[PDB]
Amino acid sequence: QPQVELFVKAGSDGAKIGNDPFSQRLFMVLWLKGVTFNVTTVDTKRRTETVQKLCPGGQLPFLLYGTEVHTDTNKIEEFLEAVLCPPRYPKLAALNPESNTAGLDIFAKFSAYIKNSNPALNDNLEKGLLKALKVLDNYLTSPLPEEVDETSAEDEGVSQRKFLDGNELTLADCNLLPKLHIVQVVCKKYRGFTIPEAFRGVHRYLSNAYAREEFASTCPDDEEIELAYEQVAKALK
């Protein structure tokens, strides 16, 4: 196996995991592949000579695979899915195309909601975020083609699958989960907003994700995420 090294964003102390859902997505992909890999955090104000030479463009995250450097998170993920393949490593792509688009609009709705300071607009932006979360909830609770089995009498027609595409984490989850993590942490801290309990699909999904080391161990600390948003999350005024 060629050497695999992921270079990721460091946090406020220049060493710990920083806020960056792109770095986290790729850490999750590599973990799910079962490949041996290293992960090196990068303080962009205090780069090492090594990092400056590997990637003088300075993009983060970046991947060293053998002696080849890759940038652009989406391209890095496509490369890893192709080159780390069966039989030694599992294919992580979703089977159902809609798994790859469900929930993708949430992060932009969240960003607008937290950056806004116009009080009159706040309830509109909160509703936009709730509606995008509800569309994700409806996807998670809709049975996929691989599910044709009876459901409990109490939850007929409700999918109980663990993750976006089925019972295994896929590339789709590696993209979405780090973004939902930010959404939940930042909205709690700066908007007093919580995902309604009635969004039972979304809450089952997050609970199942947090119980998995691939997601839990690659999350930045809540404090780091809160600090990252401290000067952009605006109070209504």
Side-chain angles (χ1 to χ4, degrees), residues 190 226-234:
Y190 296 107
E226 291 164 356
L227 175 63
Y229 277 83
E230 188 188 285
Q231 301 309 313
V232 296
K234 299 291 159 57

Side-chain angles (χ1 to χ4, degrees), residues 66-203:
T67 59
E68 192 169 71
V69 170
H70 292 256
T71 58
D72 177 336
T73 295
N74 188 62
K75 295 189 170 168
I76 293 164
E77 180 177 277
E78 290 173 348
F79 169 80
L80 287 175
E81 172 68 354
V83 303
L84 300 176
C85 59
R88 298 164 77 179
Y89 311 107
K91 141 210 184 157
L92 297 179
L95 305 179
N96 296 286
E98 193 165 345
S99 299
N100 295 325
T101 56
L104 294 191
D105 63 342
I106 291 168
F107 198 75
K109 291 166 178 182
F110 152 72
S111 300
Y113 173 52
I114 67 90
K115 290 181 177 185
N116 170 60
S117 68
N118 185 335
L121 190 58
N122 176 260
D123 293 358
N124 171 273
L125 290 169
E126 184 187 352
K127 171 181 179 219
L129 177 56
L130 283 165
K131 280 180 160 312
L133 284 159
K134 184 60 189 171
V135 173
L136 174 60
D137 189 66
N138 286 163
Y139 187 73
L140 284 163
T141 56
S142 289
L144 298 179
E146 293 70 36
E147 301 163 65
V148 188
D149 51 38
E150 81 274 35
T151 35
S152 73
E154 72 184 348
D155 281 308
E156 289 175 334
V158 179
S159 175
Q160 300 294 337
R161 74 184 184 265
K162 289 191 256 288
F163 306 115
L164 282 165
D165 197 55
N167 289 315
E168 309 300 328
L169 286 162
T170 57
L171 300 179
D173 302 292
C174 293
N175 181 58
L176 184 65
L177 286 165
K179 289 171 179 173
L180 286 183
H181 178 64
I182 293 163
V183 172
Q184 193 169 52
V185 169
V186 176
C187 287
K188 279 174 183 171
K189 178 59 189 292
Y190 296 107
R191 284 283 183 263
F193 172 105
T194 54
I195 299 171
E197 295 289 298
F199 293 12
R200 297 191 297 157
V202 175
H203 282 288

